[PDB]
Amino acid sequence: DISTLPRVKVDLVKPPFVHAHDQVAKTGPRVVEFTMTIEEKKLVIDREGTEIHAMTFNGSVPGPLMVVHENDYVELRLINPDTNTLLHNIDFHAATGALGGGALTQVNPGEETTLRFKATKPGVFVYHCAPEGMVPWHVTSGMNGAIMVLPRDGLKDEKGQPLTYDKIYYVGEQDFYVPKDEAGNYKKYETPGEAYEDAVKAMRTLTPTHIVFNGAVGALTGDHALTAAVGERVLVVHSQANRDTRPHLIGGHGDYVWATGKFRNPPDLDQETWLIPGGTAGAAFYTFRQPGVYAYVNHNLIEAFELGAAGHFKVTGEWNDDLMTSVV
Amino acid sequence: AAPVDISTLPRVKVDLVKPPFVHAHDQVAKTGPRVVEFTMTIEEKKLVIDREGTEIHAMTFNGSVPGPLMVVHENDYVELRLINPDTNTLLHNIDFHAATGALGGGALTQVNPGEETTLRFKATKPGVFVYHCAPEGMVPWHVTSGMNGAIMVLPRDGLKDEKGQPLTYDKIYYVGEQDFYVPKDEAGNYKKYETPGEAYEDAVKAMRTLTPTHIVFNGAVGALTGDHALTAAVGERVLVVHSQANRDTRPHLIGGHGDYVWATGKFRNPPDLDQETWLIPGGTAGAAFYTFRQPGVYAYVNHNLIEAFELGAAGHFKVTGEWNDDLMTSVV
Amino acid sequence: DISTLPRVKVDLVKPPFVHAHDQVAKTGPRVVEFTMTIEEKKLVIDREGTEIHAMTFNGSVPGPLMVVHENDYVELRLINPDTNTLLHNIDFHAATGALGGGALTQVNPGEETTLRFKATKPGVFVYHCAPEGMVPWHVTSGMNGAIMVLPRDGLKDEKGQPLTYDKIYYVGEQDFYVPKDEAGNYKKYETPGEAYEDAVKAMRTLTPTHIVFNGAVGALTGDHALTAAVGERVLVVHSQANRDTRPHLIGGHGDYVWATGKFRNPPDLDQETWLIPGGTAGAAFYTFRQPGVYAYVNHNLIEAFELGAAGHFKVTGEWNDDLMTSVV
Ligand SMILES: [Cu+2]
Ligand SMILES: [Cu+2]
Ligand SMILES: [Cu+2]
Ligand SMILES: [Cu+2]
Ligand SMILES: [Cu+2]
Ligand SMILES: [Cu+2]
Secondary structure (H helix, E strand, O other), X not given: OHHHOOEEEOOOOOOOOOOOOOOEOOOOOOEEEEEEEEEEEEEEOOOOOOXXXXXXXXXXXXXXXXXXXXXXXXXXXXXEOOOOOOOEOOEEOOOOOHHHHHHHOOEOOOEEEEEEEEOOOOEEEEEEOOOOOOHHHHHOOOOEEEEEEEOOEOEEOOOOOEEOOOEEEEEEEEEEOOOEOOOXXXXXXXXXXXXXXXXXXXXXXXXXXXXXXXXXXXXXXXXXXXEEEOOOEEEXXXXXXXXXXXXXXXXXXXXXXXXXXXXXXOOEEEEOOOOEOOOEEEEEEEEOOOOEEEEEEEOOHHHHXXXXXXXXXXXXXXXXXXXXXXXX | OOOOOOOOOOEEEOOOOOOOOOOOOOOEOOOOOOEEEEEEEEEEEEEEOOOOOOEEEEEEEOOEOOOOEEEEEOOOEEEEEEEEOOOOOOOEOOEEOOOOOHHHHHHHOOEOOOEEEEEEEEOOOOEEEEEEOOOOOOHHHHHOOOXXXXXXXXXXXXXXXXXXXXXXXXXXXXXXXXXXXOOEOOOOOEOOOOOOHHHHHHHHHHHOOOOOOEEEEOOOOOOOOHXXXXXXXXXXXXXXXXXXXXXXXXXXXXXXXXXXXXXXXXXXXXOEEEEOOOOEOOOEEEEEEEEOOOOEEEEEEEOOHHHHXXXXXXXXXXXXXXXXXXXXXXXX | OHHHOOEEEOOXXXXXXXXXXXXXXXXXXXXXXXXXXXXXXXXXXXXXXXXXXXXXXXXXXXXXXXXXXXXXXXXXXXXXXXXXXXXXXXXXXXXXXXXXXXXXXXXXXXXXXXXXXXXXXXXXXXXXXXXXXXXXXXXXXXXXXXXXXXXXXXXXXXXXXXXXXXXEEEEEEEEEOOOEOOOOOXXXXXXXXXXXHHHHHHHOOOOOOEEEEOOEOOOOOHHHOEEEEOOOEXXXXXXXXXXXXXXXXXXXXXXXXXXXXXXOOOOEEEEOXXXXXXXXXXXXXXXXXXXXXXXXXXXXXXXHHOOOOEEEEEEEOOOOOXXXXXXX
C-alpha cells in the first residue's frame, strides 16, 4: 500500500529559516524523504568565546525544522559518519512506537539507518537524540530539533477560519550546562567523552550556564535578526527539548498561539506571553502592525538578557500613530 | 439557610490500595450520590529513595508515597477518618484541593499522635485533585517528606472528549511525583538522622535552595520499572493520573502521546488533544488518556530529561500486542 | 478622530486595591489619562528587616493596577524626579509597537514623558521598566505592575454569559535576588548602582532569596489581609513579570480562570491551581462559599511558606454544613 504513494524529496534548511512547503496540501498523502547527517563539532556559544563539544543533527543547533502534512509518511535517512565518536539515534515526539523511533535508529559512527513513521497527529513536535543511559547529555549538547505536521487544509483559527502565514521561522531554544573548575571558570575538553563526568555534575545542578536561541548568545541579532514587514503574517515555531520556556514578542503579541503546539486544539488568542513546557514545541501566529526593532525572548528576563534567550525582529513599514505615539 | 439532610444518603466503604494501583470504582456512576467512607492511617517511617540506598524520614498517608488515590463521583460526599497513631511523633492534618472551606479541611483535621478525626466534604467539582498534609509553619516540610496524594472526582457520567462523547478507560494508574531535598554535609554526602525533628534545620536549608536532590515516581528511583513496570496491551485505553503537590512537572509518554489531556485536571473543561508533553503545575493533579497502538517498552517521564534520567522522574510501560509497520517501521 | 473622544483623568490607588471602574463599558472609547511618578527608594522586604534599593512606579511594589476598556487609548504621563539616579522607561505588554513603549519612554532623572497607545486586546497585562542592558535588574528591583483591559461588555464565562465581580484585588508577585557575602548574609549598599555587579551575580543563580506578594513577606496578612464575604464574587488579578508562579486559593478554587489572562479566550473552570508564566498577568474569579481564613499562595509550597509568596483572605458569613463539616 505504501508502495503506491508517490514520493517527494525535501532539501532541509538551516534554522531559523524553514524549507518551503504548501500550507494547504495540494495532493493526497505522500512519503516525504528527509536526510540528516549527525555531526559532533566544537561550537562557540557566547560572546566571550566559550566553546563546547556540540552534538548536532545536520551540523546546526537546533537541528532543521522538518515539515509535512497530517497522514503523510515521514521517511528519514539518518547518517552517523565514522568521523563522529558516539552512538546516536532519534526520537520523534510526532511518531508512535519504539520510543518515538529511538529504539529503531541507533547508529554507531560509520552507520546509517532509515526510519519511516506515519504523521498521524497535526502540530509542531520536538525530535531529539536519546541514547539509552545518556539522554539529557546528548539533548543538552544541542541534539534536538522539531518537525511540523500541518493539517492537510492548513491552519485554522478558533472559529475554523483559515490562518495563512506569509513567512515562518523556527526558533530552537537551548539550555547549556558548561562545567566550571573550582575557580569558577569554564573547563576545557578534548573529547565529548572526557567531559561526561563533569557534564552530569553540571546538569544535576538544574541551573543552565547559557540559554540561547539558534545555538548561541546573540545568534538571532544583527545580520541574523529575523525580519518582517507591517501587515505580514508570521508564524514562529519555538521548541525546548529539555526545559520550560515562556516566549514573548516585545512590542507585539501572539495573536494565535498553540502553546503546547497541537493543531486539533483551538489556539489561545492575544497572548502576551505563553508557556512552552520542556520537551514541547509551540507555535505563535502574529500579524505585524508597527515597524521597527522587536525583541523576541524567553520572558524570564534573567534567562533572556543575562543567559542569552533573546533575539531580534527588524520590521519595515509605516509607523501607526493611532496604535501608539509619543505625545508632545 | 435550610439544612440538607445527609443522614438519608446511602453510605459505602472503600478499601484503599497502594499506588500506582487504584481501588475499585465505576466510571459511570451506578447509583445516585453517596457518602463515601475512607480511612487513612498516618505513618512516619524510614524510606529508601534511590539505588544507592539513601534513606529518609518519610511522612506518609497509609504508609506509601504518594498516598493512595481516592475515587468518588461528582456530588458524593467524601468522609475521611484520619488516624494519627501514638507511635508517630509529629502533628499532621489534611488539605483536599477538592474541598471547599477550612483550608481544604486542614483547619479541621489537625491531629497529634494518638488522636484521630473524621472529615466530611462535598465533592462539588469534577476532576483530579491533590491532597496533602499542611501543618502551619511546617507545610513544605511535610509535603516534601512525601505526605501528599490525590483524589479523583469523576463526572457522574464518566469522562467525555472535546465533543461530549464518552471516553472509557480499560485501566487507570496513579503516578505521584515527589521532589525530595535530602540534606548533605560539608563534604557532599547525604546526612543521616534518628528523628524527623532533629533534621528540621537542615531540611529547611536544603529546601530553600529550590534544587531537588531526587524527583521520583511512586516514592523512589525506579519504583515504576522492572518487575514493577506499568503494563498495557495494544488497543487498551489507559488513563494516567499524575500529581505533583509542590513543584511543576511535564509528563511525557516516550513513544506515545496524551490523546486527551486535562493538564490542570478539571473535567468541566474539554481535554487538550494529541499532547506530546503537558505541564502540570506544582500543587496540581492532571490526567492523560491514551490508547496504545504499538507493543514494546515505553518510558513515562518528567520531560526535563535531567530530572527524568538523572534525578529519577522516569517509569516504564511494558506493552503486549502486534507491531504495526504502517505506523512505524525500519526501512531496509 | 481621537480628538472627538472624551478624556477622563484617573487617580491610581495603591495595590492590592484598584481604582473605581465599570465592568460593562458605560461609554464608548475614551482617552484614559494616568500619571505615575518613578520612585527609587529603600524597602524592607521581610520580617528580618532586610532592605533593598527598590525601583518603583508610584512608590509601591508592584506598581498600581491600571484599568481601561478594550479600544480605549491609554495616555500615561511618566515622571522621573531629579531625586532619582537612574534612567527608566516603561513597557506595556498591552501595547503594540516600540517594545511596548519602552523605546519611546526613556527618561533620565528630571525628565518626564507622555505615551499614548490603543488598548486593542482585552485581558490583564504586565507592564514593566526595561532599560536597554539593564532589564532584569530593574524588573527584579520591583519596577513592574499590570494593566487590565476589560472587554467592553464585561467578563464572560465559558458559555458567553456575564460574570460580574463584587470586588477585585491585584496581587503582584515579586522575585527578589538579594546578594549575600562570604558569611552568607545579605549585603547592603549606599546606592542602587553601587550594587549592580552583585545583583547580576545574584540574579544569574536563577534562585530568588525572596518571592513576595505586594512587596514584602506578610504584606497581605494580618490587618492587611484581603477580605470577602460568603456569596461575594471576587476577581484576583495576579502578575509576575519575571518568573513563573502557580496561584492557589487554599480552601477554595479558581471558579473561572484566565491563566494567561486574555479574555477573548474562554476561562478554565474549577481550577485548583493554575500556571501564570513569568512575564504574564492572570486573573481568577471565585465566589466564596465558606467564611473563615483562606491562604492565597504560589503553590510551590517552599516559595510560599519559606520565601514569602503567601497572603490571607478573612471571610465573613455563615458556615455551610453541607459543603464541609467535622464529623462525630
Ligand atoms: Cu546523540
Ligand atoms: Cu522526548
Ligand atoms: Cu504531615
Ligand atoms: Cu495545597
Ligand atoms: Cu527602571
Ligand atoms: Cu516584558
